[PDB]
Design a protein that fits this description.
Layout (H helix, E strand, L loop, with lengths): L10 E4 L1 H8 L8 E2 H14 L10 E3 L4 H6 L3 E3 L3 H9 L2 E3 L2
Antiparallel strand pairs: 1-2, 1-5, 3-4
The chain binds N,N'-(1,4-phenylene)diacetamide and chloride ion.
The site of chloride ion has 4 residues, from loops.
Length: 95
Amino acid sequence: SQIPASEQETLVRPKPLLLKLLKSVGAQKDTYTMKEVLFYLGQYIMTKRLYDEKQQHIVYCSNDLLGDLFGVPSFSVKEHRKIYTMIYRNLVVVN
Ligand SMILES: *CC(=O)Nc1ccc(NC(=O)C*)cc1
Ligand SMILES: [Cl-]
């Protein structure tokens, strides 16, 4: 019986600009799960300290490659659906 659709892993290939961003914090592959992409995005935001020191859910990126890739000047980590949409536009699903 097929794995429940919800439970199947989303395998993804970052387009070249997102791949460059992931490589900058140590990612060394071309293909990831969606969880791994999120991990590296966390590492990138943390490393470059893009978050507001006081309201740390808030990320500032208008002067960052991340803002060009997501297409926004800033965002909150709490915007789960929007962030998922922003990421998805920077990769191709691997069937
Ligand atoms: C359901 C699921 O996959 N949850 C999940 C996966 C990975 C992480 N990563 C870290 O905790 C660093 C969190 C939750
Ligand atoms: Cl960096």
